[PDB]
Enzyme design. Sequence first.
Site, PDB file in Angstrom:
ATOM      1  N   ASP A   1       4.845   2.748   7.333  1.00  0.00           N
ATOM      2  CA  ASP A   1       4.153   1.457   7.320  1.00  0.00           C
ATOM      3  C   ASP A   1       4.628   0.518   6.201  1.00  0.00           C
ATOM      4  O   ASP A   1       3.821  -0.171   5.573  1.00  0.00           O
ATOM      5  CB  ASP A   1       2.634   1.657   7.255  1.00  0.00           C
ATOM      6  CG  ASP A   1       2.068   2.234   8.535  1.00  0.00           C
ATOM      7  OD1 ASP A   1       1.853   1.454   9.482  1.00  0.00           O
ATOM      8  OD2 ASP A   1       1.837   3.462   8.594  1.00  0.00           O
TER       9      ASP A   1
ATOM     10  N   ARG B   1      -0.717   9.206   1.847  1.00  0.00           N
ATOM     11  CA  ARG B   1      -1.042   8.997   3.258  1.00  0.00           C
ATOM     12  C   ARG B   1       0.036   8.197   3.982  1.00  0.00           C
ATOM     13  O   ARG B   1       0.267   8.396   5.173  1.00  0.00           O
ATOM     14  CB  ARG B   1      -2.397   8.305   3.422  1.00  0.00           C
ATOM     15  CG  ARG B   1      -2.924   8.354   4.853  1.00  0.00           C
ATOM     16  CD  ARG B   1      -4.117   7.438   5.063  1.00  0.00           C
ATOM     17  NE  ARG B   1      -3.747   6.021   5.086  1.00  0.00           N
ATOM     18  CZ  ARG B   1      -3.926   5.207   6.126  1.00  0.00           C
ATOM     19  NH1 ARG B   1      -4.483   5.653   7.254  1.00  0.00           N
ATOM     20  NH2 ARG B   1      -3.551   3.933   6.038  1.00  0.00           N
TER      21      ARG B   1
ATOM     22  N   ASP C   1       0.869  -1.164   0.000  1.00  0.00           N
ATOM     23  CA  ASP C   1       0.000   0.000   0.000  1.00  0.00           C
ATOM     24  C   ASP C   1       0.909   1.218   0.000  1.00  0.00           C
ATOM     25  O   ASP C   1       1.539   1.529   1.008  1.00  0.00           O
ATOM     26  CB  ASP C   1      -0.909  -0.003   1.235  1.00  0.00           C
ATOM     27  CG  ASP C   1      -1.907   1.149   1.242  1.00  0.00           C
ATOM     28  OD1 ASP C   1      -2.005   1.883   0.232  1.00  0.00           O
ATOM     29  OD2 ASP C   1      -2.604   1.314   2.269  1.00  0.00           O
TER      30      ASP C   1
HETATM   31  C1  LIG Z   1      -5.061  17.654  11.054  1.00  0.00           C
HETATM   32  C2  LIG Z   1      -5.263  16.358  11.804  1.00  0.00           C
HETATM   33  N1  LIG Z   1      -3.947  15.675  11.878  1.00  0.00           N
HETATM   34  C3  LIG Z   1      -2.987  16.372  12.778  1.00  0.00           C
HETATM   35  C4  LIG Z   1      -1.619  15.791  12.476  1.00  0.00           C
HETATM   36  N2  LIG Z   1      -1.671  14.337  12.634  1.00  0.00           N
HETATM   37  C5  LIG Z   1      -0.386  13.760  12.502  1.00  0.00           C
HETATM   38  C6  LIG Z   1      -0.115  12.688  11.667  1.00  0.00           C
HETATM   39  C7  LIG Z   1       1.160  12.166  11.574  1.00  0.00           C
HETATM   40  C8  LIG Z   1       2.191  12.693  12.327  1.00  0.00           C
HETATM   41  N3  LIG Z   1       3.508  12.207  12.243  1.00  0.00           N
HETATM   42  C9  LIG Z   1       4.000  10.929  12.573  1.00  0.00           C
HETATM   43  C10 LIG Z   1       3.176   9.824  12.649  1.00  0.00           C
HETATM   44  C11 LIG Z   1       3.729   8.598  12.969  1.00  0.00           C
HETATM   45  N4  LIG Z   1       2.871   7.466  13.036  1.00  0.00           N
HETATM   46  C12 LIG Z   1       1.446   7.714  13.129  1.00  0.00           C
HETATM   47  C13 LIG Z   1       3.305   6.143  12.965  1.00  0.00           C
HETATM   48  O1  LIG Z   1       2.536   5.188  12.985  1.00  0.00           O
HETATM   49  N5  LIG Z   1       4.674   5.968  12.887  1.00  0.00           N
HETATM   50  C14 LIG Z   1       5.221   4.678  12.781  1.00  0.00           C
HETATM   51  C15 LIG Z   1       5.617   4.237  11.536  1.00  0.00           C
HETATM   52 CL1  LIG Z   1       5.459   5.288  10.190  1.00  0.00          CL
HETATM   53  C16 LIG Z   1       6.153   2.979  11.366  1.00  0.00           C
HETATM   54  O2  LIG Z   1       6.521   2.619  10.071  1.00  0.00           O
HETATM   55  C17 LIG Z   1       6.958   1.263  10.025  1.00  0.00           C
HETATM   56  C18 LIG Z   1       6.273   2.142  12.461  1.00  0.00           C
HETATM   57  C19 LIG Z   1       5.887   2.581  13.714  1.00  0.00           C
HETATM   58  O3  LIG Z   1       5.977   1.800  14.859  1.00  0.00           O
HETATM   59  C20 LIG Z   1       6.429   0.490  14.539  1.00  0.00           C
HETATM   60  C21 LIG Z   1       5.351   3.844  13.873  1.00  0.00           C
HETATM   61 CL2  LIG Z   1       4.878   4.363  15.448  1.00  0.00          CL
HETATM   62  N6  LIG Z   1       5.043   8.469  13.191  1.00  0.00           N
HETATM   63  C22 LIG Z   1       5.761   9.592  13.081  1.00  0.00           C
HETATM   64  N7  LIG Z   1       5.317  10.818  12.784  1.00  0.00           N
HETATM   65  C23 LIG Z   1       1.926  13.768  13.153  1.00  0.00           C
HETATM   66  C24 LIG Z   1       0.653  14.292  13.239  1.00  0.00           C
HETATM   67  C25 LIG Z   1      -2.692  13.599  11.886  1.00  0.00           C
HETATM   68  C26 LIG Z   1      -4.061  14.207  12.131  1.00  0.00           C
END
Ligand SMILES: CCN1CCN(c2ccc(Nc3cc(N(C)C(=O)Nc4c(Cl)c(OC)cc(OC)c4Cl)ncn3)cc2)CC1
Length: 305
Positions: A181, A167, A163
């Site tokens: 992811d 996003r 995927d």
């Molecule tokens: C306007 C509404 N919004 C406000 C902003 N928001 C938002 C979305 C994304 C981020 N940034 C992020 C998000 C993540 N996320 C969600 C996340 O899941 N990180 C992550 C990833 Cl990418 C992995 O890849 C293999 C593995 C992981 O653990 C094994 C993790 Cl923990 N990891 C890092 N930075 C910061 C904020 C989303 C909703």
Amino acid sequence: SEYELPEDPRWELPRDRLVLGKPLGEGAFGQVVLAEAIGLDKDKPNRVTKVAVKMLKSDATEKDLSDLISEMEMMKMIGKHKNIINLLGACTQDGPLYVIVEYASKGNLREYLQARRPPGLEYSYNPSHNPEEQLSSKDLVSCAYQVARGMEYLASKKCIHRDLAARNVLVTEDNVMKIADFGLARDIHHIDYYKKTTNGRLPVKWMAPEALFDRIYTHQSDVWSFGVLLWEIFTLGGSPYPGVPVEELFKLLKEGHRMDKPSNCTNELYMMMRDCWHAVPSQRPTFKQLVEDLDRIVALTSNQE
Ligand SMILES: CCN1CCN(c2ccc(Nc3cc(N(C)C(=O)Nc4c(Cl)c(OC)cc(OC)c4Cl)ncn3)cc2)CC1
């Protein structure tokens, strides 16, 4: 609850060194939060770094723990690249499993582009209540280049994303693109095409035909998805195949119909999209050639526009 969590002293971080903040998002039987890691780098014990921590939810089952470990161990095998989300540390001891990765402040690429939208005919309306500074033509090609680089690395490490969408790309404070992811374990069951994720997205639109019909996933199926991603960049977070239901997509692609060139896009870039959208997987370009080409276009693309 116990469970045998593998200890890896190199990745192991003490829990008193991690300060848990606000939640970043919600997944399948797991949830991500923002956190501050004290002394991530051991020869710099007094410094704080903002990180993302993944932990299981209340409803999480035995299957979910194995998945989480798999995901962590998978990131260890793939190793580090600047253009993907990297493993930083983990807490396997004295409590629930915490997986610490790199934090991207600016969110996912889809929301990043949509907020940076200029008003006008070439792009849709800006959904953001607090819109940001507009992106240049070089910034957009540069964005595509980075995603390709990251995908090129994952490809060299034999990772198939399966995927790949705006996003699933995250943007840091330094405006570095990072694939997210990528280390997911493939489901053994059949997938529901009409099914939407927690965000209300239909993944079928990023799927190559072989993946859509015969459920075949290759590096080449990711290239197709990268075509859809390219389209998203130059539509500035545009929705693929607007007003097209699943049933209408199956026939559309078989007849050989592809998405129209975005209003603001160069012919060279649209050709790149069409190349990724090639019916026959073998005829699609490799990420290796996608990086070689984009590297050339970035230099040629003026930063003024
Ligand atoms: C306007 C509404 N919004 C406000 C902003 N928001 C938002 C979305 C994304 C981020 N940034 C992020 C998000 C993540 N996320 C969600 C996340 O899941 N990180 C992550 C990833 Cl990418 C992995 O890849 C293999 C593995 C992981 O653990 C094994 C993790 Cl923990 N990891 C890092 N930075 C910061 C904020 C989303 C909703």
